[PDB]
């Protein structure tokens, strides 16, 4: 079927046309990617003992 | 929008999807590799308050975020799903909502994955999943259950996608071509997607039957009641060993186009191309014993199997050696996608180089579950599969987004990258010779030294990375700035010296494949009338 | 008049092939026989000498 | 034709699927599936409910897709020869993988019987388990599986030939054998004297012997959709991919069956 | 065929200006050095053939060069920078840390020697093991 | 009014016309009677013998010099087309990008494609 | 079948002399210089030639550039321009590295 | 009983997604809707628990 | 025999199975050195030259003569760092008549030795286990995670076979000075023959993972004279 085709029109994010700056989800998408594992280590650090 | 992505149906999408998440869990896994590195950094417990099984979890989460979640859904199913109806003419591939699915079981699998390493204690057995460790009577709690669930979901993503991209390759290709006029990707991900179909029904058996010695009390591997856990690992690695050729063949086949792309002339010997890895994918499944040396096999499988490893030398040194004489008598356009092709040609050779010295049965008493041992693998996987993907994108990126990243920005990460990735991954080499045992969390103090300088090293990789994080967004930002400004290079090809600039203004593009003749972001559904050929 | 020149390129693969294998020939020759051989050196004489205080 | 109508068609033979949200659905299916098991089998789920409704979603799902992939082949008539021959390749493919998943287990046999454990007793089948007699049931189980194979490529030729009546009778009738081997393969499990549960040898017998089952159990739902097909003139005497499907699956089925027979009954005791 | 010849003032020092014009102009230029072309070629004077070379084989649009003149220098400040980030980073989050093992000690690796060195350890390798202060 | 079932590959009008009269009552139905849509083009195409999706390769018999080109037929306004050579296979394969406005030529052989379409969209 | 010297320069002459317009031209001399030989004097006289009848002055001057690139040695280079001396001088074609004295 | 050729004049004459042009797609469509969205919401509300640490009771 | 800090090559040798492995890798090494320098100086020299080359030679393709040269080249490499695998191999795999056995089975997190060839009042097999000192009980001169409670007492110049095993997960017992690598699974036991030829202390490691204490669990083996070893062993 037919899709809009354009330099924007091939990612599912949305770049120019923003109410929020884009490099605050382009940069949050890899921030909650590298905190995983942060998130997983304080989670395994609770439930012995510490932070 | 839904329609568009969730509801998924063509390649491009796919591949757009796949490369997200594929991107996503590299950051997921060099997160991991950072704390690994970190803590690993200097003796006694410094971030990790003992915890050894918080340490082995982290260890398991990379090396699965890195191989099933990073290098798989961008090689196979990113570039793999985006480029090989390109390459052979095909409209859309075959069996689309099988493509669909492959990546929608993609990041469920990250999430029992994750849901895994939160619950009780973790999977803290490896990336290998060895029993009776892996049993129930050593890891109890869901986490190891759910770590082989995340593998079977990644299992079901490629194998169907190796079914598509059989089907696709072998009945969708253009009217003119046969199978000896198939670019080398296209080639590589064929054989690839084969060893796949061969390699994954194994790993699924063995994983299965441990799922069942966990939890529906039943011995296949337990010692008490007649198992074996040398049959897990026969069926593992006869999985494993052809999936790390899985993981370097589209690394070979990227570079021998980025190569000849940015040399000026033909593959040197393309037909002993295919041919090199189609002989390095048959000799993956006879190999896969030399893994497990130690185990005590007799003498004779051993010097069978040490024998059958070197063979492999063989056609990986065609392919290295023709790589060198394509670049021969070139005109070298030494842009970023040719700097990693040549830093995946020589670090891929120290690699490759390594684990030859590690293939002799007699040798690998020595070093087996060492960080010799690392060090190779690092080598071979970092270098010829991350190199290869920062080489595929800086290569394609411009043509599938429309948008043409910073140049200066590109050659600074790659340097990083190379030096940090260098600077890590070489002393492990003498720690490794030294006698420092492979998944410890802490080490006799004696260790240290190397360890340091190796801790080092990551934070400059993870610094490109944060780079590479920048350019995406310098590229998604400013890309039809970068084409308007001299910040990028826009013509990978030059004009050769006697053609003027009209005659190339004319001619822009002068490439052996389709992929770069197709416009700005190529259309939904391209190739309304076939391609043709002669 | 201007004799044919030609085949420079094969002239030139093969110097740099026999170049490459003189390099690699060096660094390992180097290799054996500094550092293999002065351990092998080493190892032969302690045990030479430890031979000698068994007497 | 003319230019005029043949610029109002495809003009290439491969099948454009419409958005569908089969794939993302079965997904999320068999994501609920692996959670709810994997938090069932050890007690943080009170009762194996939630595993039947994942399963059954995810058997809706599958019901569902292949009710669009079926309306896509008889209604819209978009499977051409270039998506039948795509199709059944691929199901040659699939069925590979099947084969490969046998012969691991397969593999696990040989290697827990060829080297016996010293706590088995170092002789296969071990000591204090008396092994299932070849002769009484399985004979019957072989002897009505290779019936429904040659029954079922009867009905095939049947239905080449045009003839309704004989194709369906055989289908049929391949169907209720296949349902038979089904229920005394169950019978033979109610009255045996180990348990999957009893070492390596029950491991690994009713693990070969319950994949087949499931691959039977799957055999027949496929014998009776194109059963169902057929009957209502969906199937046509010479478009069908489906029924040639169910004909392979048949054959490589019953091929399996042979070897398992062999190895776990005419070797294993 | 074409008038005398080209005019001074929009041809001289083509090399420096060429890129800043409108492409109007350029066009106007390509079309009358290529009516001069067909004159014999010892009629055309310096500054033509000059701007006739630059226009077909200067090194600008499609012969853009990778590095622009002044890269390299960038890339090589930008590497250093980022190792020097790098390495304090490092140590910042070193400093972040919990303390060091009781054993990285001069004292007590010393000791360790003197056990090692009664054991003849390491014979003809090296048993010392100091590595700190 | 009612439209036909389009008989042979010249009646066809649309994808309405390709249904066709399913099996009477009892009998398998044929291949004539109930397929429908592309499979039915393409069925009738086999019954008079009209390859409907034409796979014929590139046309590489003559060089294809700027004054006769080398004519391709086109259903849209452009065409890819990887040339090898004036045999089959003389050079590499050139992929070029020929359109309605402009030719494509090698580079490598100097062939020269110029597009024709059948248009009307 | 790899070709000897003399059926190179013959078969150059010829696709020289059937050039038509400086796309033609230009491709000739492209894939004519892309060989592991330096062509012969004759070829690049029907090469100058081409270039005045398409009249294109500046591949006239990157023929001689070519062929600096190409050959390998700074004499063999003389050789080749001393003996295309009357024919430069009659087409009135300059080096390009007497074309920009620096 | 021979439905075919009505129900491709009804399904390639029809401005719906292909699942919902046969006239008895709702009932198939709608409580299945129902009852995948409980069976996937299910599940993730009991991993809390696991990372909690609590087990089903055994009531 | 024990670790040193910013080592680049293996520990000292005491048996001769781990010269031979040496002798083995550095022979190895040789012929890897030759190829790698072989492709740095190719990459290098066709790099800076073909980096400003204008005209690039598009016609050189095939090259038979090369491709057969690069294709046996590498077969015969392979062959001449193979033949002295085979011989090590076949040479180490032997069990020539071991004047001593004896048993170290490996249990979670620490190891037991069993030497039940010998005696320790009549006849009775002698045992002990080896547990790690814990970090807070090490005085200062002993080394961390590497020395243990009670060490493997060994006599030197005999042929000793250890007999490695395990009791829940599979433990790797590790001499890398003594160059002995071999593993334990629960089911089967693993045999490996040694000859330490100079009396001190040698340390090794578990390689296999086993849990939570896989880094804290290593193996200390102190070679001693036959005397020595004996009134240790009547002493045990
Ligand atoms: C894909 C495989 C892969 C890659 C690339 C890496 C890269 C790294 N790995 Fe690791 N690792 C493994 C797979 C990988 N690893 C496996 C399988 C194990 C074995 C586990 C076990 O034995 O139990 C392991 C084990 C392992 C160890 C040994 C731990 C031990 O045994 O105790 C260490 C120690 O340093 C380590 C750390 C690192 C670091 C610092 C990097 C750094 O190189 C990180 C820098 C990398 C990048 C910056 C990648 C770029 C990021 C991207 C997202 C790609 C971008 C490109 C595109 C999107 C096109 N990992
Ligand atoms: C990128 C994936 C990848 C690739 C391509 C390879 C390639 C090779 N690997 Fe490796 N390997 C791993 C990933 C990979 N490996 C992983 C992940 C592990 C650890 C698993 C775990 O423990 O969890 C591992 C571990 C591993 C082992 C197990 C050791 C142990 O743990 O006990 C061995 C032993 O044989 C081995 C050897 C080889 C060899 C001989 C090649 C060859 O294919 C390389 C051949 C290439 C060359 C040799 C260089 C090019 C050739 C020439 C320049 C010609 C001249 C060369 C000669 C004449 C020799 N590697
Ligand atoms: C389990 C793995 C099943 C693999 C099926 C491969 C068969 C060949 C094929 O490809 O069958 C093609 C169909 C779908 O094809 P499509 O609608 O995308 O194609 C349209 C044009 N043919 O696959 C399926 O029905 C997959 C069904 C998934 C069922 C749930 C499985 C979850 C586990
Ligand atoms: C021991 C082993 C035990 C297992 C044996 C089980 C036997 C399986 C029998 C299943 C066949 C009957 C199903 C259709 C009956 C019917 O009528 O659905 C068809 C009905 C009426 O028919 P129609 O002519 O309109 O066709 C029109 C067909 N579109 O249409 C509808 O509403 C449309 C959708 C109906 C929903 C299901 C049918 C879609 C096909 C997919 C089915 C795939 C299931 C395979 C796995 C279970
Ligand atoms: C992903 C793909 C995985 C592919 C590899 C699958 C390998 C495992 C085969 C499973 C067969 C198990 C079986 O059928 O078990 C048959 C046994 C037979 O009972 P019994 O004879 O002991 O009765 C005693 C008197 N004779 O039932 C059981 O006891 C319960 C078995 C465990 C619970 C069911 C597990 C089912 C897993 C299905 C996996 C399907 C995928
Ligand atoms: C899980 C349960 C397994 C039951 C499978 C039922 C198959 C119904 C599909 C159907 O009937 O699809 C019919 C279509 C085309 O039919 P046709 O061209 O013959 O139509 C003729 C009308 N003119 O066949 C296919 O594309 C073959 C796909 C086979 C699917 C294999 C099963 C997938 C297993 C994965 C798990
Ligand atoms: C890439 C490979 C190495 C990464 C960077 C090298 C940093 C070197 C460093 O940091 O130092 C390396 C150390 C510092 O020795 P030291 O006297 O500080 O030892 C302090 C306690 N005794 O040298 C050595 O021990 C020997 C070095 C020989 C091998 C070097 C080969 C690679 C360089
Ligand atoms: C590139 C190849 C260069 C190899 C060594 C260079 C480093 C210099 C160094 O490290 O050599 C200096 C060291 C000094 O440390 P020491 O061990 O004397 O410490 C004494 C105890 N306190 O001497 C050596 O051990 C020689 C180097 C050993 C090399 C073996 C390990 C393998 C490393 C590379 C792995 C293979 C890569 C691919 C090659 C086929
Ligand atoms: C084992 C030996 C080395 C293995 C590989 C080394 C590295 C590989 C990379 C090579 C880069 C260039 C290759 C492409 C060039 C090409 O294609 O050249 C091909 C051209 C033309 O073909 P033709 O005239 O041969 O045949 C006509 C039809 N094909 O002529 C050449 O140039 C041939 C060069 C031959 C080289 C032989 C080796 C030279 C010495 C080897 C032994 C040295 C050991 C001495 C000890 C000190
Ligand atoms: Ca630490
Ligand atoms: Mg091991
Ligand atoms: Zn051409």
């Known amino acids: 079927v037919h899709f809009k085709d354009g330099v924007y029109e091939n990612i599912p994010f949305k770049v120019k046309g923003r109410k929020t700056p884009y490099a605050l989800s382009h940069f949050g998408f890899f921030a909650i990617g590298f905190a995983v594992p942060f998130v997983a280590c304080y989670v395994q650090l609770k439930k012995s003992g510490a932070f | 929008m839904v329609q568009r992505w969730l509801y998924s149906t063509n390649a491009k999408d796919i591949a757009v999807l796949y490369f997200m998440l594929a991107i996503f869990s590299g950051m997921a896994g060099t997160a991991m590799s950072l704390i690994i590195r970190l803590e690993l950094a200097a003796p006694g417990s410094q971030y990790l308050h003992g915890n050894s099984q918080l340490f082995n979890v982290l260890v398991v989460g990379h090396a699965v975020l890195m191989i099933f979640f990073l290098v798989m859904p961008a090689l196979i199913g990113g570039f793999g799903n985006y480029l090989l109806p390109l390459m052979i003419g095909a409209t859309d591939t075959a069996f689309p909502r099988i493509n669909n699915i492959a990546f929608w079981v993609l990041p469920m699998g990250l999430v029992c994955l994750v849901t895994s390493t939160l619950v009780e204690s973790g999977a803290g057995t490896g990336w290998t999943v060895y029993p009776p460790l892996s049993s129930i009577q050593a890891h109890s709690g869901p986490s190891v259950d759910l770590a082989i669930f995340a593998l079977h979901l990644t299992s079901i993503s490629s194998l169907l996608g190796a079914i598509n991209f059989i089907v696709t390759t072998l009945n969708m290709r253009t009217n003119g071509m046969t199978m000896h006029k198939l670019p080398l990707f296209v080639w590589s991900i064929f054989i690839t997607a084969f060893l796949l179909l061969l390699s994954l029904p194994v790993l699924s058996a063995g994983i299965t039957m441990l799922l069942l010695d966990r939890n529906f009390n039943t011995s296949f591997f337990e010692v008490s009641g007649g198992g074996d856990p040398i049959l897990y690992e026969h069926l593992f690695w006869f999985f494993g060993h052809p999936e790390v050729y899985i993981l370097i063949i589209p690394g070979f086949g990227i570079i021998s186009h980025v190569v000849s792309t940015y040399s000026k002339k033909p593959v040197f010997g393309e037909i002993s191309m295919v041919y090199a890895m189609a002989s390095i994918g048959l000799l993956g499944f006879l190999v896969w014993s030399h893994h497990m040396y130690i185990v005590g096999l007799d003498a004779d499988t051993r010097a069978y199997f040490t024998s059958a490893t070197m063979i492999i030398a063989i056609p990986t040194g065609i392919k290295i050696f023709s790589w060198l004489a394509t670049i021969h008598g070139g005109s070298i356009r030494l842009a970023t996608p040719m700097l990693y092709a040549i830093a995946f040609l020589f670090l891929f050779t120290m690699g490759g180089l390594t684990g030859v010295a590690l293939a002799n049965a007699s040798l690998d008493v020595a070093f087996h579950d060492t960080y010799y041992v690392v060090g190779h693998f690092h080598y071979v996987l970092s270098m010829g599969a991350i190199f290869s993907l920062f080489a595929g994108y800086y290569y394609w990126s411009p043509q599938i987004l429309g948008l043409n990243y910073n140049e200066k920005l590109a050659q600074i990460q790659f340097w990083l990258i190379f030096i940090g990735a260098n600077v890590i991954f070489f002393p492990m080499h003498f720690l490794g010779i030294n006698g420092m045992p492979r998944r410890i969390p802490d080490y006799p103090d004696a260790f240290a030294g190397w360890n340091y300088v190796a801790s080092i090293g990551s934070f400059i990789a993870t610094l490109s990375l944060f780079l590479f994080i920048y350019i995406l967004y310098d590229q998604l930002v400013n890309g039809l700035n970068n084409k308007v400004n001299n910040k990028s290079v826009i013509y990978n090809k030059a004009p050769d010296f006697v053609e003027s600039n009209t005659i190339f203004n004319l001619n822009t593009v002068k490439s052996s494949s389709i992929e770069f003749l197709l416009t700005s972001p190529p259309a939904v559904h391209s190739f309304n009338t076939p391609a043709v050929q002669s | 008049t201007i004799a044919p020149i030609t085949g420079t390129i094969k002239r030139r693969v093969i110097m740099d092939i026999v170049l490459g294998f003189s390099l690699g020939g060096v660094m390992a020759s180097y290799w054996w026989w500094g550092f293999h051989m002065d351990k092998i050196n080493k190892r032969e004489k302690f045990y030479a000498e430890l031979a000698e205080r068994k007497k | 034709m003319t230019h005029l109508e043949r610029s109002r068609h495809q003009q290439h033979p491969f099948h454009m699927v419409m958005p569908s949200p089969w794939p993302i659905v079965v997904s999320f299916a068999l994501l609920s599936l692996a959670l709810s098991t994997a938090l069932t089998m050890h007690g943080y789920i009170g009762n194996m409910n939630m595993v039947y409704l994942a399963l059954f979603v995810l058997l809706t799902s599958s019901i569902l897709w292949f009710r669009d992939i079926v309306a896509e082949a008889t209604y819209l008539g978009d499977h051409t020869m270039a998506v039948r021959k795509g199709i059944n390749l691929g199901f040659l493919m699939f069925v590979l993988s099947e084969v490969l998943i046998f012969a691991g287990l397969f593999w696990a046999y040989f290697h827990s019987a060829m080297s016996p454990d010293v706590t088995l007793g170092a002789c296969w089948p071990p000591v204090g388990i008396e092994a299932v007699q070849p002769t009484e049931l399985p004979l019957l189980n072989t002897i009505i599986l290779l019936s429904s194979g040659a029954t079922v490529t009867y009905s095939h030729h049947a239905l080449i030939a045009g003839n309704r009546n004989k194709a369906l009778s055989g289908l049929l009738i391949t169907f209720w054998l296949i349902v038979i081997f089904v229920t005394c393969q169950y019978i033979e499990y109610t009255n045996a004297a180990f348990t999957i549960s009893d070492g390596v040898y029950g491991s690994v017998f009713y693990a070969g012997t319950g994949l087949h089952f499931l691959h039977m159990v799957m055999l027949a739902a496929m014998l009776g959709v194109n059963y169902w097909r057929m009957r209502n003139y969906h199937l046509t005497a010479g478009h069908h991919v489906g029924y040639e499907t169910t004909i392979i699956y048949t054959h490589v089925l019953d091929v399996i069956w042979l070897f398992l027979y062999v190895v776990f009954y005419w070797w294993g005791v | 065929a074409q008038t005398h010849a080209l005019s001074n003032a929009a041809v001289m020092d083509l090399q420096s200006r060429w890129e800043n014009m409108p492409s109007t102009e350029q066009q106007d230029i390509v079309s009358k050095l290529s009516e001069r072309q067909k004159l014999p070629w010892a009629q055309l004077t310096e500054p033509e053939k000059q701007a006739v070379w630059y226009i077909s084989y200067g090194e600008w649009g499609p012969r853009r060069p990778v590095l622009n003149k002044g890269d390299s220098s960038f890339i090589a400040k930008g590497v250093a920078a980022g190792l020097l980030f790098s390495v304090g980073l490092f140590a910042v989050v070193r400093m972040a840390g919990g303390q060091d093992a009781k054993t990285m000690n001069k004292e007590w690796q010393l000791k360790s020697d003197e056990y090692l060195k009664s054991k003849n350890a390491n014979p003809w390798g090296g048993y010392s093991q100091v590595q700190s202060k | 009014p009612v439209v036909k079932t389009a008989q042979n590959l010249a009646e066809v009008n649309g994808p309405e016309t390709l249904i066709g009269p399913g099996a009477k009552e009892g009998t398998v139905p044929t291949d004539l009677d109930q397929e429908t849509g592309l499979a039915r083009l393409e069925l009738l195409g086999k019954l008079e013998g009209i390859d409907v999706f034409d796979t014929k390769p590139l046309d590489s018999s003559r060089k294809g010099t700027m004054k006769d080109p080398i004519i391709i037929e086109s259903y849209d306004d452009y065409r890819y087309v990887g040339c090898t050579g004036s045999p089959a296979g003389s050079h590499t394969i050139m992929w070029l990008k020929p359109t309605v406005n402009e030719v494509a030529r090698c580079w490598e052989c100097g062939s020269v494609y110029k597009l024709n379409p059948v248009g009307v969209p | 079948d790899e070709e000897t010297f003399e059926e190179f320069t013959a078969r150059y002459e010829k696709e020289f002399d059937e050039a038509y317009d400086l796309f033609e031209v230009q491709r000739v001399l492209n894939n004519c210089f892309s060989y592991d030989l330096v062509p012969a004097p004759a070829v690049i006289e029907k090469a100058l030639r081409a270039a005045r009848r398409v009249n294109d002055l500046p591949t006239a001057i990157r023929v001689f550039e070519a062929l600096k690139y190409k050959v390998e040695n700074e004499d063999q280079y003389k050789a080749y321009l001393d003996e295309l001396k009357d024919v430069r001088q009659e087409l009135g074609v300059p080096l390009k590295e007497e074309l920009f004295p620096s | ?59 | 025999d024990v670790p040193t800090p910013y080592a680049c090559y293996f520990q000292d040798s005491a048996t001769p199975n781990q010269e031979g492995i040496l002798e083995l890798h550095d022979n190895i090494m040789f012929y890897l050195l030759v190829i790698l320098g072989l492709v740095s100086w190719m990459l290098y020299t066709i790099v800076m030259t073909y980096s400003k080359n204008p005209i690039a030679y598009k016609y050189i393709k095939h090259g038979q003569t090369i491709e057969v040269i690069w294709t046996i080249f590498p077969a015969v490499i392979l062959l001449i760092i193979a033949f002295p695998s085979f011989i090590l191999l076949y040479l180490c795999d032997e069990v020539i008549s071991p004047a001593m056995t004896i048993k170290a089975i490996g249990y979670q997190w620490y190891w037991k030795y069993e030497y039940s060839d010998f005696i320790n009042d009549s006849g009775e097999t002698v045992e002990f286990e080896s547990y790690v000192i814990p970090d807070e009980l090490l005085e200062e001169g002993q080394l961390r995670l590497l020395d243990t409670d009670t060490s493997m007492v060994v006599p030197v110049d005999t042929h000793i076979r250890f007999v490695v095993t395990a009791a829940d997960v599979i433990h790797d017992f590790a001499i890398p000075s003594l160059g002995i690598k071999v593993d334990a699974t629960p089911g089967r036991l693993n045999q490996v023959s040694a000859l330490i030829q100079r009396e001190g202390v040698f340390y090794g490691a578990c390689s296999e993972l086993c849990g939570t204490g896989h880094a804290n669990m290593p193996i200390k083996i102190e070679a001693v004279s036959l005397p020595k070893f004996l009134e240790w062993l009547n002493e045990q």
């Open chain 8, 1 to 59: 009983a021979n439905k075919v050729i009505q129900l491709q004049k009804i399904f390639q004459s029809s401005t719906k997604p292909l699942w919902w042009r046969h006239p008895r797609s709702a009932l198939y469509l709608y409580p299945f809707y129902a009852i995948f969205a409980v069976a996937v919401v299910t599940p993730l509300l009991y991993i809390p628990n696991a990372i909690r640490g609590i087990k089903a009771k055994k009531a």
